Structure formats: C-alpha cells, structure tokens
C-alpha cells in the first residue's frame, strides 16, 4: 500500500490548486507517522486508535502553506487559506500532517512557485477546489485590468532562506477517511 509517493513526493502543488490521491485496497502502519513531522493531529477519530479500524476509502491531499498558516488546516478555522484555498468540514474525520521544508522549498533569492487565493466572493465549501484566476471586483461585476477596482485573486508565497519560522514553507498532507 503506497504512501512514500505522497509523503516523499519530489514536488507539491499550491494550496489553492491542491491535489488529491486515492488510497484503497490495502493497509499500512499508521506507526509510520515520527520526528519527521511537526504537526500530526487527528479529528473525529482518535490518533491512538487508528490501526484498529477499517476504511472503505482514504484520501490524501497534498500542498504547501507557510508556517503560521498551518493552524488553518483544521475544522472551524478562519483565514485566507481555510476560507479560500482548502476547507475542512466541522465533522471532519481524519488526520492532518505537516512538516518544515525550508531546506528544499526556500531559496536564497526566493522561491515563488507556491501560491494562494486571497480574494473570492464567498468562502469555499468543505473539500471544494477553485483554480479559476479571474479578475476580482469587490462590486461583483466582471472587470478587465488595468481597470480600477479590478484585482488579481492570487498571490505568491515568497519563500526566502532568511524568513522566520512563521513564513517558512511547510508541506502538508491531509488524510480523509470513510
């Protein structure tokens, strides 16, 4: 049952464009999850009683967010990420894993590959995904830049090797059960 293809993946997508991988028909040690992770918190189920249950489905979600933005990957959370990029339900049942990846994702001149949505009419519904990138108008009308009141909904996290821990790259993997 493959997992190293998710956790030890060479690259990761941006939150707003978060990717999912379907896992079923197999089993694995939830012991494999270590000093490797900085954040490992389970919801709806018990972090200790895992190897004791059957799951008709398991879903792994990959992406990158800044350190301070990790705490937004949990139920009942508010923020740009939870609101506009990747949302968990209040009844969420699964585990959130995270870890610091400055050594591979930050750069001395700056890595801007990772991005997040910061503007959107209405928050995302649990497990929704929006990769639109269409000019934003607080009014609600369609505008074409360089019009005034017209803005780009996407921003690049800027991962430099000098930024403090709060603004450092963390890779995240969210595990959904069934």
């Amino acid at each position, epitope marked *: 049952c493959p997992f190293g293809e998710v956790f030890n993946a060479t690259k990761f997508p941006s939150v707003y464009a978060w990717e999912r991988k379907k896992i079923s028909n197999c089993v694995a040690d939830y012991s494999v999850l270590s*000093t*490797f992770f*900085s954040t490992f918190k389970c919801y709806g189920v018990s972090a200790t009683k895992l190897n004791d249950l059957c799951f008709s489905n398991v879903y792994a979600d990959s992406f990158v967010v800044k*350190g*301070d933005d*990790v*705490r937004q990957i949990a139920p009942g959370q508010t923020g740009v990420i939870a609101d506009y990029n990747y949302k968990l339900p209040d009844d969420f049942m699964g585990c959130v894993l995270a*870890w*610091n990846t*400055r*050594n591979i994702d930050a750069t001395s001149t700056g890595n801007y590959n990772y991005k997040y949505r910061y503007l959107r009419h209405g928050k995302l519904r649990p497990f929704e995904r929006d990769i639109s990138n269409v000019p934003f108008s607080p009014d609600g009308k369609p505008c074409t830049p360089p019009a005034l009141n017209c803005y780009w909904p996407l921003n690049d996290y800027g991962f*430099y*090797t*000098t*930024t*403090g*821990i*709060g*603004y450092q790259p963390y890779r995240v993997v969210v595990l959904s059960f069934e």
Partner: antibody
Amino acid sequence: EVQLEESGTVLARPGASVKMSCKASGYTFTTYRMHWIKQRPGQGLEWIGAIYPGNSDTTYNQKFKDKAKLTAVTSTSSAYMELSSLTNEDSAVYFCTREGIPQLLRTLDYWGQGTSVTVSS
Amino acid sequence: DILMTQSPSSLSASLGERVSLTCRASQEISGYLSWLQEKPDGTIKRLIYAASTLDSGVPKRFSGSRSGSDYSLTISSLESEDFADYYCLQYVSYPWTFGGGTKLEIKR
C-alpha cells in the same frame, strides 16, 4: 515546564575547538528552531545562527559562517554548537533560545542560562 | 541586515521614577520586536514580545508601544531589580539583530 539547560563553563586554548550544548525539555525539540546568541564581556548581544532538529536544516550568520557548527541529537533532545580556530575574540558568553509557531509569540520566550567560554594558552 | 538603533545607551534614574527606552528599526518589522532584560548574573528574561504584549509573570510596570519605526519600552515606577541591562531585537527575519543595549543605573 519548558527550560533550556546549557553545558558548564569551559576553558580552551587558542586555535583549539570546543563544543557546548543546550538541552531542551518540556516541549517538542523537533518543532522549534534553536538559536544561538553570543555576548562578549561588557559588549552587546549578537546572533550566531540556528538549527532545526526536525531535519537538521541550518541557518548561519554570515559573520560566524566559518567559526561555528550546529549539530543536533533528537534522541537526547540536545542542540550543539562547536567553535573552532579559537581566538581571543571568541572569549564570551553564549546563549541558546527558541523560535516556534506562531513566530510572533513562540520565540525568545525561554533562554539557556548562558555558557562561558574563555580562551587562554 | 535590519539595523536596530537603541537609545539611550545609558540611563540614570531613581526608585519610583518613570522611564522609556526607544528602538528604531531601519526596515518594516511588522511588530516583531521584543525587549529583553539581562540581570548582572547573566540570566536573560523576555519582557515584551510582539511589540507591546507583556510576557507572563512580568510586572505591570512594564509595557511596550509601537509608533512608526519607533518602538519603546516603558516602566511606570522603577524598582530595585529593574536596574539592569535592556536589549531590543527584531525577530522577523534572519539574521536576528539587536540594539546596542541600555544600562540602567541608580542616580545619586
């Protein structure tokens, strides 16, 4: 209870190497960045560098790039700093502290009691 | 490197006197400023963090305020063990940079 116990006073000769320690307890050692501050007698504070035990990633003050080396052993929750090419200007007091999430509030909150290095032949 | 200008480098006062230290950052540090106290014996305790938030267990005498690139540590009425060394430092990015420090002695 969170606390940082640093190794005891050290005497060292010019051009030698010395390795001190800063052991952490009362929190997850692997989640925080361990920072090192140097303070020469009667002078100010200064940043040396810092290590991330989770994966041993490091960051170094350019100035002390070839003077210090940060290693870490997670099994004993201990951070280490090794100073080399010892000169007069290395005689000082050295402190360790932490940087955690949220950065805004989980950093500079706890300090080691300081280690004293004196260099003399 | 962000330069931290801490003034005054030395200050003389008396018990019950009100004093204020100032640190000016050469760049935006978004309230990532902390003040530290260093008692003679070499121990260091964090006083104010996040520019104005008082740390736990630290007396109410102490407070911090942000104004432009100017940040300031204030002590309402001095007490005996308050007479020590004070440093501010920015911790937004690397490398962490400190102020020259302040030595608060007893006036006579």
